[PDB]
Structures are given as structure tokens and as C-alpha cells.
Amino acid sequence: INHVNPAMDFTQTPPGMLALDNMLYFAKHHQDAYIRIVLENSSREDKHECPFGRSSIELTK
Amino acid sequence: EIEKLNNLQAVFTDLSSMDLIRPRVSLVCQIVRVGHMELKEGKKHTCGLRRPFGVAVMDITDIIHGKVDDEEKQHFIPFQQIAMETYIRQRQLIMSPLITSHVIGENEPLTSVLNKVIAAKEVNHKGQGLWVSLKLLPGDLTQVQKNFSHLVDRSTAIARKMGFPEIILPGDVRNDIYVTLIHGEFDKGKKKTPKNVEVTMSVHDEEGKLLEKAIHPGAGYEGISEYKSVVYYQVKQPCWYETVKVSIAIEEVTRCHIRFTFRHRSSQETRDKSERAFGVAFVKLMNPDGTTLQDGRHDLVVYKGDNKKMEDAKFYLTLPGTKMEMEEKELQASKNLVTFTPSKDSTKDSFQIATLICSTKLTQNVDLLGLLNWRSNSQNIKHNLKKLMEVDGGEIVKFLQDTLDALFNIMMEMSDSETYDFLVFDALVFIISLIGDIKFQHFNPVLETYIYKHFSATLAYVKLSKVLNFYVANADDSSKTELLFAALKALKYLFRFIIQSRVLYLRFYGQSKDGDEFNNSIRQLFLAFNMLMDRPLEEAVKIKGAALK
């Protein structure tokens, strides 16, 4: 929802940083499906769009 | 065309588990751009011309095995594409400046490309590709167009694979002519750029008039009157791997020649439009014997120079376009220097097509059409019969009933050479042995149809019972055995022929002058079997086992 203070969603632990560790290690290893996620979220601008950051925080906690 | 934006249901038929056992299974997907010749500016290029762009590849070995059934899953195909990448690869090469090179965008050999992308274990697609889920549906259009309306609607496209089936029904209607384009020679010459050939293959009647829709370069797409081809960037030995499909009325195609014009394409649109075909090739669609041009890799013949002898429709029927025919022209010229002389319109260019046509009506069997018109050429019947048992089953089963009746004409009309009729017997034995297989089990209904409907022989039972009885009784020869082995593995259907022969004779003749001797022939037939199974079985253990079988 915000793009002037983008790091607001990083202050709820569970989990905080380990979500970023998650996405780090995925960027290291699963790059194919990684960029596939990146460009598959790139077509639905209605409410069917899935927030990788918010999905990550919710799921991980 | 946003019509195929969402409802792309496709089915590319003619695939079996025989196709599955190919050790590694894949699908190749090359995509070309249409429009400007090149995606830059500085001048005006022709609207709607083609340079290939790259290949998107995924292997489908166990994907078609159907262990994982996933409707939505849009597997990503990493779209390998020609490296139009000269931004960072060259700008900084320091400490040794001597650099003069060129760019290979369409100067790229296709075998290399295909086998590399197969053997390239990672393609950094730069976020480029597309999305499909390949599904494998058993059955044919009936099931998918009844059961799988959610998987296959009516508008579901079809592609017809380069394969005669293994479950081969009669009337598996295929007027389906497949011709493939691979490569040709085109040297540098004056303008050291090899000439920018855009294949303009043209389908004419017997007088050079172009017909409509006959070229179908897309399976599931509609036909065209005229064909433009994709362009490679002046390759001195260009390779296309190009494939188009055509479909013609089985009669008109017999009186059709198809002319192939190669037009030179300058960079600019207007001079591209003004320049005409610098070289014109073609091919017929038949053989003077009535057969069609044999299949396989046919290197092609093209020429430059004249432009009126390359368009005078009634003449260049009489010109060469392919190898087999160019050397027959030169051989008949090698034996007579009259009415044919190789000309001086030949350029150092070339092309080749590997033709493989899966249609029911064309006949690439010289021996077969020797058989059919045998009244003209009944002399070769020696060699015709000798080489029958070397014929592919498919060509046979294509016109089996007509070939049967032809053979019956030989055996009825020509009663002189009984040994020729022995050869006839052997040939029909070969035929029926082919018929009995599960590769062609579907034609037995057709055989019953012919028998109970068109079996028009009357003398056949007498003579053929005599022949088989001579065979069986006098089979002590080891070379004569295997003929009788296959005969014993073919008894029922030839007996059907014998019985239909006899009953037709009796209905033609009211009663019998030969019933006594015919039933005799049966009795000595069984006597021959007895004597067989009382010879030293050392010769025919298996064979007499099959006899009682």
C-alpha cells in the first residue's frame, strides 16, 4: 500500500528478517521459477494479483 | 488475432507409443518476425518480410507419459533467440586493437542451433518465452470432440504428424501431401552477398496458371495461392529446415506442375518490389509411367539467365527441376545428342527437398504401376513378380483390391506360363500374409467386401487348387518349403477365394462339369497333407506343426 516508506512491513517478527533470508536463498537457487514468479505476477492488475512481499510475511509468520 | 488469445486448444495427432520410445522426446518451437526486414531504421524496408528470431525448446519425454496430470501448469519454455546483443560484448576489449568482424544473426546453421539448444543445459532467456500445458489425449477426433469438449472444442486446431499409423483403418482419409525444405547452394559471385532468395513456390495447372489456396504452410491454418519464405542473411549454403503442406484434388494434381521462383530481395522496399525472380525452378507431380515422384531427399535443380523460357508454361513442362530427372535427361542425352542438351543457363545455386507424402492415392512404386497397366508391359511380369515380395506393405494396402483384380487378370487372361502363375500364387501369399497382421487387421472387412461383392474370378479355384496341391505334395525341396510355410500360415483366406471362385462358376454355369474332379483335387490335397506328415519331418517340423495348426 505504501511506496514512500517501503520497509514498514519489516517490523513484525514473526518473522522480520528471515522472510528476507527466505527470498535471498530462493534467489540463489530456484532462479528459474523465481523469475517465473516475477514475470507471472506481471499481468493481473485486478485484485487477483498476489503480493510476494505480503504473501511472504503472512506465510512465514 | 486475439481470437486465439484465450481459447488455444490444440491437438497434433498421429502420435503413438512407437513415437514415445524415441529415447528422448522434445518439441521444437521457432518463431519468426514478420514486417520490416530488420528491426532498425535509416531506410525503408519491405513491409512483411521475415528473418528468424529464435527457438523455444522443452523436452516432453515423460511429459507425454502423463504421470503428472496438471491442467493449469504453464511450464515455461526458455525462448532461446538469436543473440542480437552488441551492447557490452565489444565496447571494452583493451590492450590489443585489431578488430574487423561481422554479425551472424541469420548467418547461423540450423543443425547447430537445434542440437545446441538441446545440449545447452541453460538458456538465460532474459525473461522471454511463453506458457503452455501439453496434454496427451488417447483416441481421435471422436473422443476429444465428444468426451473432452473442455479439452478439445470444434475450433481446436489440428496438426497431422509425418506418420502413417500403426492402427491403420481403411479410408483413413489422407489427401495430405507433405513436402519439406532444407537447404540449397547459393554462392557469392559479383555481389559477394549470396543472393537473398525468398522461396516463391507456386502451384500451377498443366499450363503455368496459378491455382488458389493449394499451399497450407500451417496445419490448422488455411491455404494460400502464393507463398513467401523466411530470409537468411546471405548464407552461402543456406539451410531452412522449412516445412509447408499442400492438398490437391487427386485428379487435378495428376495434371499439375508446381513452379518455384527465387526472387532477389534488396534491403529497400521499392527495389525489393521491382526486382523479379532471378531463378525459376519447379517440379512435376507425376511420372510418365503414371507413378508420382519417389520420396526422399531430392536435391533440386534451378537456373538463372532466361526469364521467358522459365515462364513459357507449355514449354518448361519439359525442363529439369530435380536430380533423378536431371540425370535421366542427361543420360537420354548421353545416348542421343538430339532434342535434349544440357544448357548454359545454369548458375552455381542449388536447393533440395526431402519429400515424404502421406496420401492414399499417389503411388511411388514403379513395379506396382508396371503391374497395373500390364497389358502394355506384361513382359516384366517376370521381374514384376520377382520384386513384388520386396514391396512395402503400405503401398500395397493402399490399392490392394485393385492390385488383386489386376493379378486375377494376369492369371485368367494369361494362362500360358503356369510357372508365372506359380509366381502369382506366391505374390498373393505375400499379400495375404501382410493382411493377416495386426498392423493391417482393419482391411479384412474390405477383403470380405471385395470377395462377396467384386470377386469376379470363375476359373481361379480349379487352377489354384492344382497349384497349391502341387506345392504341398512336392515340397520336399528346402527352398520350396518357406513358400509353403507362409502358405500354411495363409490357408483360410485363399480358401475363401477358392470357394467364392467355385460358387461364382456354378452360378454362372448352373451345374458342374468338374465337381467330380474338383472334389477329387480336394481328396488328393488331403492325401498330399498325409504324405507330408509322413515324410521325414526333419525337413518341415515347424511347417507341419503349422499345417495341423
Curated annotation (Swiss-Prot), chain A:
Entry's localization field: Cytoplasm; Cell membrane
Signal peptide: none
Modification Phosphotyrosine occurs at: Y34
Tissue specificity field: Widely expressed, with a higher expression in the spleen and placenta.
PTM note: Phosphorylated by HCK.
Role description: Involved in cytoskeletal rearrangements required for phagocytosis of apoptotic cells and cell motility. Acts in association with DOCK1 and CRK. Was initially proposed to be required in complex with DOCK1 to activate Rac Rho small GTPases. May enhance the guanine nucleotide exchange factor (GEF) activity of DOCK1.
Assembly notes: Interacts with ADGRB1. Interacts directly with the SH3-domain of DOCK1 via its SH3-binding site. Part of a complex with DOCK1 and RAC1. Part of a complex with DOCK1 and CRK isoform CRK-II. Interacts with PLEKHG6. Interacts with HCK (via SH3 domain). Interacts with ADGRB3. Interacts with DOCK5.
Protein name in UniProt: Engulfment and cell motility protein 1
Source organism of the structure: Homo sapiens
Lineage: Eukaryota, Metazoa, Chordata, Craniata, Vertebrata
UniProtKB/Swiss-Prot annotation, chain B:
Compartments reported by the entry: Cytoplasm; Cell membrane; Cell projection, Podosome
GO cellular component: anchoring junction; cell projection; cytoplasm; cytosol; plasma membrane; podosome
GO terms, molecular function: GTPase activator activity; guanyl-nucleotide exchange factor activity; small GTPase binding
GO BP term, example: positive regulation of epithelial cell migration
Keywords assigned by UniProt, alphabetized: Acetylation, Cell junction, Cell membrane, Cell projection, Cytoplasm, Guanine-nucleotide releasing factor, Membrane, Phosphoprotein, SH3 domain
Keyword Transmembrane tagged: no
Keyword Metal-binding included in the entry's annotation: no
Residues with the N6-acetyllysine modification: K549
Record domain C2 DOCK-type: where: 174-358
Modified residues (Phosphoserine): S96
Entry similarity comment: Belongs to the DOCK family.
Entry comment, domain topic: The DOCKER domain may mediate some GEF activity.
Subunit-structure text: Interacts with CRK and CRKL. Interacts (via N-terminus) with tensin TNS3 (via N-terminus); the interaction increases DOCK5 guanine nucleotide exchange activity towards Rac. Interacts with ELMO1.
Function: Guanine nucleotide exchange factor (GEF) for Rho and Rac. GEF proteins activate small GTPases by exchanging bound GDP for free GTP. Along with DOCK1, mediates CRK/CRKL regulation of epithelial and endothelial cell spreading and migration on type IV collagen.
Protein name per its UniProtKB record: Dedicator of cytokinesis protein 5
Organism: Homo sapiens
Gene transcribed to yield this protein: DOCK5
Interval of the full protein contained in this chain: 270 to 818 of 1870
